[PDB]
């Protein structure tokens, strides 16, 4: 259709719809292209790395950067590009990249009983939070000479995330 | 498009079109959502299980339960969500679930020479039929407290299946 | 949408858009069906084989055989059916099949730094070129009794490929 | 060598050596055979299931049943049959099987920072504990007619587990 | 230990021990090396192929070619190099290779209920037998210039296979 | 046996024996333990990374650090822990780690026709060399607080590597 304009979901902002672009464990950086109306390969990560969780965007949201709000989902099994999943929001990852400031939503697959226990950011084990941060700090390292860069600023809890979700939802309506 | 309304196929009812929702070997229960027009994750199975064959529905059919007729396909290699495959009908799996009675079609990938020998239900090895039944009898066991349940009634041959296919085809035209 | 009519790309003919039908390493021969508007399974290869690279077609091109121009991509990680990737053209594989003459484009994922060194056909290692040829010469061997056949004629360099790309692009406009 | 007689480890009983027999996610039930001195396939699970964690035994221990003490490990990535890993003991799974009473040790890979947070049984999410229990209650269901059976009695904490580890260690020395 | 001298098994010749060298689905041609006492990589198949079933040898047997008797096993899930599995003998594959005449045993994993129905060669579906034959006729095709070759002579039933098993068992005792 | 004392091979130093410890694509850092005589898990890498090639050691060699000479192999398909493979030496990776100076051998699977073209370090594509270096510079980043560190010094050609191989071979004899 036009995945970027799917409804954000009825349980929003606590539980939102997310379009998965990159499965967890993948080094193939895919993206949904509204113009082509299909998933395109943006690039293959240059280092021996993979996304630490499933990556996608929240449909019908607009970040301050003009794109929908992005997020990383903790899943039991990696998802596939282009599928829609209800995600429970538990936190934010703040970072500064080439382009500017940025905040990514941290969520868990809402319909997986194995994760019912992750309700706030303090619930994501720190071994996992360190893996995520280290990913974002090195994954664009081989693309420096291409002017890409990233710095991780810090983490925020479920209350802060919901406020950002709400604001990107409003902004999209505008 | 709208996968639920694709043509059932020219060789129907003997050979029908099927939209695959869940690959064999997957614990990610996906479903096609006509309203969203995309594959959505309905849920992750709570137990350490996986679909014993590829699961999907027959487009342009309507079961007595108001949904298209569902079915399980025996394949050499697991398929992917959202692909269309011609399936040869060889039997029925009768079951009673929370909601009510139900019959699933048992089929084989029509264009795979390794399976040309499976022509009727008596051709599906019983080690395989037991695996299928045991799947449907335990997979919703951890979702009891959520009011889900299932009981397997029995198996039917290719003649019975064709009659149900024909009837759900008619009913869809209505 | 209609993947066959997506734009061929701005960097064409040197760098073109390709719709992936079969991932590298797959024995599931998928194809995009414009009529159904979905990926369908054409068949499962009968032998214990898999595509030596990702297979798909160039959108908005028309070969002399009336279909878009087909091609094989060298990738670091197998792609998925239905995704669009920018491919750098480095050569041609000429062959004669049941139906007739045929030329397939040989390309590399354009946005993968691990492959930046493959710029012409002479850059594809010959151990790899032999694997490709042997694939096309035996993969339809079990489908002879079904009147399918193939013979590999030879390889052509990036200059020849570009000329064919350009010609199938023109022809599509017609 | 003789994996059953490897040292239990210096940090025992808190951290013990474990010989992995079945990787997590596997349906191939392997076992180490001291007599043959190799990993043998005991059987393929009859249902569409897989071990919910890596399964193996503690070397140089003897349970009341005459075999070494068995255990299930929570890992980030499945292990391989025959490798030795240091496992941190956090709990016990009590069960009754055909043969008799039984207690399995629940542990986590000791050298994986992503799991440093699992220190006692109350730390294993209950969605995970339910998956484990349901596995042991249904996995031998298709082997009933072969006189196999299992009932899960309950869970015990790290203090109880250590006591059993210590006792099977002593008993082995005997 | 010395896998080549493990016991052939108590249920021999009907059910024999087999040391798996190459998992089904693998292109890595491993072999057990008695001299090194370890699994070594003999070579990577040059074509885009994989073993159609798990390959290994029967311990304590000696073929007319001076090596133990080789065989191909039909399994539900690929096995791993160096594991021992009880295999039920159902047939023979006769072939002529560079070196000479040769007969491979065709078997099924004995302890997998999904295969209990394969009791003689006539039970291996012909789509499967064609895949096996085509494998052996093309897999050494890229190694011709290295003087390797193979021709498949025909298939034999469980009675013929047992006779060969018995004879290679006797011969080993010698 | 004792993998550390296997023969280095007859074609040494040009082609050497290597015991694989970590498959390419793995995050499970295994090691052969002579004392236990088995493969043990040393640790799970803390970041979302994997070895860029298969890692192991050359048997019957002794580096200046008292351990056998280590190396990274370029393979078509990842290998398994504990298998022996003949590796063709094409270069050296010099680095400084916590402990001290270090040089790793860079090799290719000798019996894989797809790699026959990699004969010297200048033949390893630079997209690949950058991936390797970036791996070694970040993989121990989350283990800093554990006093681990690494710096990559540079690369050396096949002539330099052979000299180091020869020297570690001599030293082992001592």
From Swiss-Prot, chains A, B, C, D, E, F:
Q: Which reaction does it catalyse?
A: diphosphate + H2O = 2 phosphate + H(+)
Q: Which molecular function term from Gene Ontology is one that the record holds?
A: inorganic diphosphate phosphatase activity
Q: Which UniProt keywords apply?
A: Cytoplasm, Hydrolase, Magnesium, Metal-binding
* Cofactor or coenzyme needed: Mg(2+)
- Any keyword Magnesium? yes
Which major enzyme category is it? hydrolase
EC number of this enzyme: 3.6.1.1
- Superkingdom of the organism of origin: Bacteria
Kindly give the Gene3D superfamilies that the UniProt entry links to this protein: Inorganic pyrophosphatase
Enumerate the subcellular locations listed in this protein's record, separating them with semicolons: Cytoplasm
Which residues bind substrate per the record?
Answer: 29, 43, 55, 139
Pfam families in the cross-refs:
Pyrophosphatase
Q: Which residues bind Mg(2+) 1?
A: 65, 70, 102
Alphabetical GO biological process terms: phosphate-containing compound metabolic process
Binding-site list for Mg(2+) 2: 70
Q: Name one GO cellular component term.
A: cytoplasm
Q: What does this protein do?
A: Catalyzes the hydrolysis of inorganic pyrophosphate (PPi) forming two phosphate ions.
| Quaternary structure and interacting proteins, as annotated | Homohexamer.
Which family is this sequence assigned to?
A: Belongs to the PPase family.
Q: What is this protein called?
A: Inorganic pyrophosphatase
The organism of origin for this protein? Thermus thermophilus (strain ATCC 27634 / DSM 579 / HB8)
Q: Gene name?
A: ppa
């Amino acid at each position: 259709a036009n995945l970027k304009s799917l409804p954000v979901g009825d349980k929003a902002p606590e539980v939102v719809h997310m379009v998965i672009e990159v499965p967890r464990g993948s080094g193939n950086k895919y993206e949904y292209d509204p113009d082509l109306g299909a998933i395109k390969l943006d690039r293959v990560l240059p280092g021996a790395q993979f996304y630490p969780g499933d990556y996608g965007f929240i449909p019908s949201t607009l970040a301050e950067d003009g794109d929908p709000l992005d997020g990383l989902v903790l899943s039991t099994y990696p998802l596939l590009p282009g599928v829609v999943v209800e995600v429970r929001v538990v936190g934010l990852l703040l970072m500064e990249d080439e382009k500017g400031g940025d905040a990514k939503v941290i969520g868990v697959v809402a319909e997986d009983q194995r994760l019912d226990h992750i309700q706030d950011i303090g619930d994501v084990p720190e071994g996992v939070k360190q893996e995520i941060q280290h990913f974002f700090e090195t994954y664009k390292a081989l693309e420096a000479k291409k002017g890409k860069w990233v710095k991780v600023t810090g983490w925020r809890d479920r209350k802060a995330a919901l406020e950002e979700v709400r604001a990107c939802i409003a902004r999209y309506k505008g």
